[PDB]
């Protein structure tokens with residue numbers, strides 16, 4: 001009796017070379033209770049916008065909410081002016097158009113709001129969509145590619161609800177400290193759905209769309225997952241894993257084997273992050289049921305996928321230090337609240353500017369620095385002196401991780417990424433920005449634990465000129 005997995009529509013340009021996105025409020029049902037929800041072209045979540053490398057598209061965005069919002073293309077390398085950070089306000093009842101000139105490798109990216117101080121609430125209410133970038137190279141690989149049959153997006157999110165059935169979002173001292181988390185897991189908006197998949201190989205495009213919760217994917221019968229792509233695109237070869245940790249905002253594409261008369265579940269395993277192994281997440285928790293079917297499939301697991309360029313020489317590059325911090329009093333009170341409500345299981349395994357980078361809370365009208373254009377830079381990001389998890393994301397770039405929180409990156413994490421783990425230690429990434437970003441439409445760099453972002457842990461930076 002499980003509902004079928006909802007499939008976002010795959011949306012391409014029309015004869016005018018446009019795509020229309022409407023942002024609005026509607027209603028959804030969760031376990032027989034109605035909730036007010038927000039969506040793109042719909043009442044919850046959104047479509048998957050399909051783009052080709054080297055082709056321009058124009059996106060018309062209609063805000064039919066009664067409050068301001070913005071639309072950011074997470075993972076897509078575009079100029080500040082169309083990046084849709086906090087300065088890209090779309091008035092309630094208004095329309096903004098952006099032209100996107102796609103110039104990066106095939107990848108699964110996504111889109112969501114970036115309204116200043118309110119991003120967590122707007123994502124919790126339901127706003128998220130997907131971007132599918134294709135190029136010439138990926139289409140020659142004979143990967144599974146029937147959308148909604150053997151090539152399927154999997155957007156995983158937690159929410160909590162009040163007794164009246166509404167989504168229960170509060171930015172308070174506990175949530176500003178540890179993040180907004182809940183007791184109900186959704187998969188493309190549904191609770192424990194089933195997906196009917198052809199015998200052979202199934203391609204899952206995994207997105208952790210949670211506000212604050214880290215995930216760790218595995219299968220019910222321990223069959224392996226073959227990682228084929230990260231945030232910014234294909235890896236050089238598939239990497240076989242028994243489990244796959246995924247931070248907030250991260251994407252991975254995996255292939256899994258589907259065999260006759262053997263259903264299995266995709267699950268998430270308990271994580272060690274504060275607050276996130278509370279019941280029902282103290283044990284392995286189901287995400288979706290895979291049901292084998294006997295319709296045609298042509299997809300395969302290739303020996304080779306692509307080629308990564310060599311990491312450049314590190315001598316001579318500009319180094320930028322980014323020190324993350326949390327107000328000791330916020331940490332104090334939030335942790336105490338968490339302990340009092342839930343006890344030891346919560347540790348298993350004015351705060352509106354309390355969270356900072358280099359001693360400064362986000363200033364929308366003062367960028368912290370100007371980065372070079374077209375030149376490699378080394379950015380060193382530290383959570384030393386703090387216990388919380390900071391998945392650190394940088395707009396405008398796909399980067400390479402040199403060191404991740406005390407160690408070289410795992411093989412499946414060594415390709416193109418837009419997020420890096422920072423948690424009580426220091427990480428180092430190699431970045432290059434191909435496009436301009438002025439003071440009036442600056443690039444953001446921030447923790448993707450959304451409650452931290454909303455209470456100050458973000459900076460603006462410009463990109464202007466390069467070598468002179």
Ligand SMILES: [Cu+]
Pocket residue numbers: 074112249448
């Ligand atoms: Cu994002």
Ligand SMILES: [Cu+]
Pocket residue numbers: 072073074075393394395396
């Ligand atoms: Cu982003």
Ligand SMILES: [Cu+]
Pocket residue numbers: 086116364
């Ligand atoms: Cu602002």
Ligand SMILES: [Cu+]
Pocket residue numbers: 329333
């Ligand atoms: Cu206090």
Ligand SMILES: [Cu+]
Pocket residue numbers: 328332
């Ligand atoms: Cu204290």
Ligand SMILES: [Cu+]
Pocket residue numbers: 335339346347
């Ligand atoms: Cu604690």
Ligand SMILES: [Cu+]
Pocket residue numbers: 326331386387388
């Ligand atoms: Cu903290």
Ligand SMILES: [Cu+]
Pocket residue numbers: 078079434435436
């Ligand atoms: Cu550009």
Ligand SMILES: [Cu+]
Pocket residue numbers: 072114393395444446
């Ligand atoms: Cu962002």
